[PDB]
Amino acid sequence: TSLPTSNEYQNEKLANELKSLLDELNVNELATGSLNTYYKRTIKISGQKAMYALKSKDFKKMSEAKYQLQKIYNEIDEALKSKY
Amino acid sequence: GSLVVKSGQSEDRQPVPGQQMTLKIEGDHGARVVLVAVDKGVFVLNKKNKLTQSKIWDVVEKADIGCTPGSGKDYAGVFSDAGLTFTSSSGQQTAQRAELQCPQPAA
């Protein structure tokens, strides 16, 4: 068959990246349960942004939500290591 | 000594409420530091009685026993104005002083 065209493959790569973080979203939202209220407030706000971005397929919102969800994930990772 | 408080981060201006940030404190080795962080709105309501290092040196100068920027009427007045007592075996000695305070200028 013919190979995929210019942007179809690129848009799929971005979506796969967002789907990956969404799979562990319920885990991270749960992980903040024992953390401070800053995280619980931050992640549920960042969570919907990614959820809406995926079903809307908006490149602008999918890109930002990816890095927005990635940052709060890193904040949780450092929080759990320093909490022990 | 020298105590300095600054930000640990070098970017991400104006942090977000609840965000974690690093407070950096540079100071002499072995010293104990006490902290307090207050909203500036409280000082807009009342900024009086704020303690500072300058007001500390102000209280020290107000407790000084010297009363003259030097010199004097004689050698005895030099020491007595500076805040010293002198006494020798020969007999020369400083003027007698029985008051803690400094004599008040005429103004």
Resolution in angstroms comes to 6.0
Query: CATH number, domain at B19?
Result: 6.20.50.160
Residues A41, A32 contacting (CB under 8 angstroms):
no
Min distance B22 CA to chain A CA atoms (Å): 13
Residue B24 domain boundaries: 1-62
Using a CB-CB cut-off of 8 Å, the residues of chain B touching A38 are 17-20
Residues B24, B8 contacting (CB under 8 angstroms):
yes
Inter-chain touch B20–A37, beta carbons under 8 Å: no
Method: X-ray
Task: List B residues 79-98 in contact with A (Cβ-Cβ < 8 A).
Answer: none
Among the listed residues A45, A81, A83, A24, the one whose alpha carbon sits nearest the alpha carbon of residue B16: A45
Among the listed residues A11, A10, A18, the one whose alpha carbon sits nearest the alpha carbon of residue A69: A18
Residue of B nearest to A71 (CA): B19
Could you give the CA distance from residue A69 to residue A49 in angstroms, rounded to a whole number? 9
Query: Could you give the C-alpha distances from A7 to A4, A14, A59, B16, B73, in angstroms and in order?
Result: 8, 11, 11, 35, 97
DSSP per-residue string spanning chain B: ---EEEES-SS--SPPTT----EEEE--TT---------HHHHHH--TT---HHHHHHHHHHT----SSS--SSHHHHHHHHT---B-SSS-BPPP---SSPPPP--
Confirm or reject contact between B18 and chain A (CB < 8 A): yes
Could you give the CA distance from residue A65 to residue A25 in angstroms, rounded to a whole number? 12
Residues B68, B82 contacting (CB under 8 angstroms):
yes
Among the listed residues A73, A50, A54, A67, the one whose alpha carbon sits nearest the alpha carbon of residue A15: A54
Could you give the CA distance from residue A65 to residue B90 in angstroms, rounded to a whole number? 92
Could you give the CA distance from residue B34 to residue B26 in angstroms, rounded to a whole number? 13
B82 Cβ contact list (under 8 Å, min separation 6) = B66, B68, B70
* Burial degree of A65 (CB within 10 A; 0-12, 13-18, 19+): buried
Residues A47, A61 contacting (CB under 8 angstroms):
no
